[PDB]
Symmetry: C6
Subunit: 303 residues, 6 copies
């Protein structure tokens, strides 16, 4: 919905946004949105995600796909009406994203998902990318474990020529929806085959917002392989503006920079990570400064 | 509709256009068009806006979407017939834009929306863009508050990877229609994901006119993040009523304002600074030729 | 239809074409085609114009849109059959353009639409374009008034972020059809969003000049060559060079414009210079025969870069 | 249909092809094909031409469009079957081009259409093009009159912003079909708007063959306007390989080169034309050498 | 179908492939496949070829087009089922190419089609191309006559602005199917208009295999008249069984012949001259590596 | 499905992945997945592969195509539901790839398919490519024989102008499905026409490596990088780099090839050099662990220019 502001109510939002990343307990928002989802009466649609064609599939609170659902109009506070209808396993009426309000007046936030090694990490989508010899796949699994903390992280596998990997986009989005519905920390390996169909474009523009609203983090690997001049800009656009955070490799092997958006129209934070391999290629991450736009664009130009 | 002119009736229009920006009370036009919308008998379509596919959804005066509406033919003054029909939530007959006449003979104007810091600002669409370190999002919220004045401004959020942001274009246009139907000052953050579907092209070409006719202002951020750059330049140059663009110095912005159909564009400079929690404050008439304008556009 | 010629009948056509621009009374052709349209029995389709999709809408002599019309076959002189059918507000059979013969044997002309400041102006489409500081919008309104003369000119507004401007292409073509059906002098502001591409937009660019020249009316359209994208500027150049009957283009000096006029199908293009100035409330006033070769023409077009 | 050859029957074809251009009386072939068309029983389809969509409209011997026609299978000599069917004004079965055999064993010819100023001109399509100040429109009308000789030439008008000009492609092809069905010399002004829809591509590839088979000549103006690098190659391809003859302007105003294909796999002929204007811009053309491929490509590179 | 191999059965295939080009009598394979086609019971589909849309038309052994044919499932040796069905003149089920097995275990061959002037020529598709002043059309007719030998060659004409030339792709493929069904040596003039529709892409990828399986040769002219040049190079390099290309000297041509699946390509030089009425006469084993091959292709 | 991990269960997966390539018996995985397929009750869909249009055809355990199959919902361990439905010979519901779980918790592996000349080779797709004079076709047949070992290898032929070669994409994918369902070692000659693009072709390139690695079979495909068109060579590089489990590429010296093998999802790539020579009738014979970094890998890929 839309929101009205004056100087005073806008100042409050800014303070609340600052708290959502800087002072709230890590994982709080996820726990809150879990409660909201749990309170939804059983069978009610909560999440719609776009399939390859551009149509959408719909899930309930238990991550069960909804095949049929009678038309149902819900009137919001501001007067706006949201209608949801499902027929033959596809969304007839409604929109992509969260079908129940998980956020209320608390919008434009990057809810803190976890704290590791003295740094706070944001929910939403984290893209892991860059060039050089530093491996993406070992990093995303290390990050998934680290941000998981006490909790296990979920792995969605997609589009690699290895055993057990799904390569069908429609199964991929089904896995993602379920992961965001049930887990705080989610790893995607990889985002190469989405990088184009309507579903793929939708996913790139939707997933960051879906995750930030949930309070979960989606850690996606994206190897910038080809040199074709239009596709590299799509990698840069996904890295710059479709991701809540960016994790990018550097000139030195094992070393990564983390760039974190802290909130709608707020300054982006940067910190450096050191890593090393243990037995069987398991990577271990070793244990606040702002960044301007020219520094940001300088980092993007390494891709 | 079409309009006929001779020297005399054209001279009157020019005078009336000049007044609509320079001498009319700020917010007047919005208040007038509010009255026109309020006088529309209940259930009559007033606004149609294009969805992603290129079809259109239709709203009444209360910003309620119309699912069904019997065919209805209205004859204009010039003899042209406008037919409106809605079925299954979509426009069967009609056009995108305002479905009732908000303007009459008063066309080609940039109705003054507000006055702030000694400068008059135009209704229609304002695109906030540019490169460098000056932030777009804090500027649009500061501008929304400033032009709001006594009134609260409306915020439409779209296409950012942050909490509560809608990313579905069809919800986005629903929010916009409602905002223009009910509020004088409107902020859009951001216009990146529209920058391509039929709906997106329609919106870029429609929204400035929709807003200028209403007397409301739509302040939209557009971070120019490689040929599309021309689509950013075209949106900035010719699809926006005003342009707010960053400069070499951080916090400093130039405002370029179209004052009317075939009139000179005005320019003024804004200074800004941040307070607590990254809240931006804007500190408190010269014409610009085309070569100066194109020089400004070439910074994008 | 098609036309047969020998040396003699072709020479007559050339003479008649020369007269249609150089010696006929200004506005004559418009008055003649008005009479032809008026003689059409009521309800008969006269004009079809393409909408955004590429389908066509159809109008009668009174500029009323035709929703339904029984199939009807009309045999021309050369033996060619033109069938017209309309159903559910769209053309089922027929073609875009004039559905009745307004021209007969008199084809390939640029019928003189008006005379102003010692110069004759052609009917058809005039594109007003160019770069520099000289404003397009004030010029088209000044030209509309000047060529209007005793008559008011019609203004079609399209695709600007200002009050009352329609931005829907299908309403735009409805306005244009009505304008050409009822008025000799017509202003379009602006032609940017058609250059911004749909089937209707391509059709309009290729159709409108011929529609207007056949009517004897003039369509004065502004076209600001904004973007530097290398394919779109050629579409501006192509519209200026070959889809317009006349070209009005700005120069290095502010207020000064060159007018390039096609006088007839295989004929030399004429050029003259206009001076202008602003009065009160930004009202522009235009102040009061030489041929041009192709290399001079292409030289003029290369300023649109 | 297909044709079988040995050394001897192939040598005969070559001789017959040589005669069709060099020794046959000018206009002979047209008169012969007129007789063939006249002998077709009334109502039988003779010509199909593609409309904008790529569907085809069909005409009888009198240049009357056929709205409906029962399915009808005709067996050729070699065993090949040609089926023709028309329904709702469009071709259901059949092919684009001539629906009756106008040529028999006499194929690959450029039947002489006329003789003017000591030079023989070929039937088929002549494209008039080039850059510089020499006007295309006055040249095509002068050529139409000259090759017409005793006969009037037909003018098809298309795609110019002048009075009486049709701009609808479907009317354009209707005019062309009628012109080729009834007249030996045909002028098209202009071929700019076809230069893309299926109909336009079809027309460019079809018309030369349609005309050469009829023994009529189609003289089409084509101003090479824009500099866009793919469209100029389409102008070059139409000039080089879709036209039977090419008439192209030179460095000197009023002077034109004519390049004529004399037959399937035969040498191309070249000659120079001088012109001048009389009263009311009427152009007058003033009154055998072979050309190799490198000379031909050199001429094309002026476009 | 698929084939299984070990060292021994693979060695046999290689020997049989070598013989199919180097030692078998010229024209043998054509005569054998003629017998196979003749033994097909009347009305059974034998060949399917793609039309402009990408659908396929189907022919019987007599080169008669099949309008209707009941669904019919044939089980191959490896267990794979081939179903053929035709309805309303188009293939409902099946595949493009030969619908009856003409080859069996004998696959990957270039069956010798003829011997002329001391050189053996392969069946399949021969593309005649190149730049310079040496004419393509006279060469293909000379080659058609020479490889014909005692037999007349068939000429398919397509896409030239000359009398009697068909320009409709669907008639073109009908002519080709009939030619391959009934004749060993076939000339196509020209392959320019196919060089894009689904049918055209299909034909380029299908025809070489169709011809090599039949034991017939398709000699196609292709004048390389700006990126499509790669489509000409790809057709010349990998879609043709043999390549005949002009040289720096007029009348002189190089012939590059694939002798079999994964075998070395052979090269020889041809001299030609014109007689009366532009009739060309061709005057009367060395391997070539890949770098020499790519060097030849770079002249296009 | 999705998998949950902590440090400990992730460490186990890594160890199991290492074993799947380095210590398991060659061909083991194939034999295990054969058993899984054999235990599927008869008539149940096991494999779906995309045809030219982008629709999918479906096969049972015996490599028989399924024309019709009632809707059937199977619930996985994680709660995710997989529905399979076939009608009129095409997949109505389901996904491309394996329709039964062949892998369980054992994912991200490169199951060892064979051992030859002191080197272990991975299952999945091997692309054989490169420039220079070293022949692709003789190499793939030599590799098929060598990795076959005691077993015959299957040959799928596609898109060459030689006798008996199928050129229809829909037959090609039918052959491939059957090959992977019944044989451990599979040769494809060639992969040029799929790079020559339809939905089916794009699907196949992105699907086949995973299909094969999951089965424990190896698909050895030749891919001659012919044309110099700048977008198509990147599609060859992308297929070689990221769509293939292993890469076999020719070198400056004739007969010599480099083999680059992915050992597992987040693991180091291995490299070794092969020498070859021809015997009688052009039969190629291959003569009888070092890791490679990314910059060395990209250096190898840049030879395909
Ligand atoms: N123990 C170890 N030591 C050093 N480097 C290692 C390593 N284990 C893995 N790596 C590196 O990690 C990389 C593997 O991950 P990535 O390259 O980022 C994605 P990928 O597995 O190559 O799939 P892709 O084909 O989609 O790129 C390898 O290039 C390898 O060099
Ligand atoms: N207190 C403060 N002091 C200085 N700069 C600040 C600030 N708060 C925010 N900014 C600047 O404002 C910018 C944020 O606004 P935008 O220009 O719209 C980029 P964004 O919206 O965050 O990402 P996007 O371009 O993907 O939408 C940042 O570049 C940041 O440097
Ligand atoms: N009184 C006056 N004196 C000098 N110049 C004037 C003027 N009134 C108008 N102009 C000039 O006329 C121009 C307006 O016309 P144009 O710029 O050519 C098209 P536009 O109406 O601005 O729409 P566009 O900019 O979206 O294309 C202004 O840029 C201004 O410089
Ligand atoms: N009497 C005359 N003397 C010299 N040149 C003449 C002439 N009459 C006509 N011309 C030339 O002939 C040309 C007109 O024909 P063309 O340019 O070849 C096609 P066009 O009429 O310009 O339509 P186009 O817009 O499609 O190009 C003019 O450029 C003109 O210079
Ligand atoms: N008697 C002769 N002496 C020398 N050259 C001859 C000849 N007869 C024909 N030629 C050459 O053969 C060529 C004709 O064959 P092609 O190379 O196929 C070109 P085309 O088929 O005529 O046009 P196209 O490329 O548009 O198909 C001409 O270039 C001509 O110079
Ligand atoms: N006995 C032998 N000695 C040396 N080289 C041989 C050989 N047998 C085959 N070759 C080489 O192997 C090559 C054949 O394989 P490739 O060229 O790599 C693919 P192809 O089978 O030719 O199909 P393509 O050319 O359409 O891609 C020949 O070019 C030849 O040089």
């Amino acid at each position: 919905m839309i929101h009205l502001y004056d100087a005073k109510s806008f100042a409050k939002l800014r303070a609340a946004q600052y708290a959502a990343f800087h002072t709230d307990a890590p994982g709080s928002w996820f726990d809150h949105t879990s409660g909201v989802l749990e309170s939804v009466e059983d069978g009610t649609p909560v999440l719609a995600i776009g399939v390859e064609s551009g149509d959408a599939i719909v899930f309930d609170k238990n991550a069960q796909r909804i095949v049929a659902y009678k038309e149902k109009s819900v009137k919001a506070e501001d007067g706006s009406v949201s209608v949801v209808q499902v027929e033959n396993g596809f969304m007839k009426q409604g929109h992509r994203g969260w079908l129940v309000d998980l956020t209320g007046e608390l919008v434009g936030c990057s809810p803190v998902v976890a704290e590791f090694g003295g740094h706070r990490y944001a929910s939403g989508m984290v893209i892991v990318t860059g060039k050089g010899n530093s491996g993406k796949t070992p990093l995303v699994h290390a990050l998934g474990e680290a941000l998981g903390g006490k909790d296990k992280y979920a792995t969605v596998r997609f589009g690699e020529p290895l055993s057990g990997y799904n390569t069908d986009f429609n199964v991929f989005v089904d896995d993602i929806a379920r992961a965001m519905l049930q887990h705080r920390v989610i790893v995607i390996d990889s985002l190469k085959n989405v990088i184009i169909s309507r579903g793929a474009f939708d996913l790139l523009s939707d997933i960051g917002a879906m995750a930030a609203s949930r309070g979960c983090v989606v850690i996606a690997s994206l190897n910038p392989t080809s040199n074709d001049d239009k596709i590299v800009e799509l990698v840069k656009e996904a890295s710059r503006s479709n991701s809540t955070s960016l994790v990018i490799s550097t000139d030195v092997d094992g070393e990564w920079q983390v760039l974190t958006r802290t909130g709608e129209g707020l300054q982006r934070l940067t910190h450096t990570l050191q890593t090393s391999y243990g037995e069987h290629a398991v990577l271990t991450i070793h244990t606040q400064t702002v960044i301007k736009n020219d520094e940001l664009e300088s980092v993007l130009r390494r891709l």
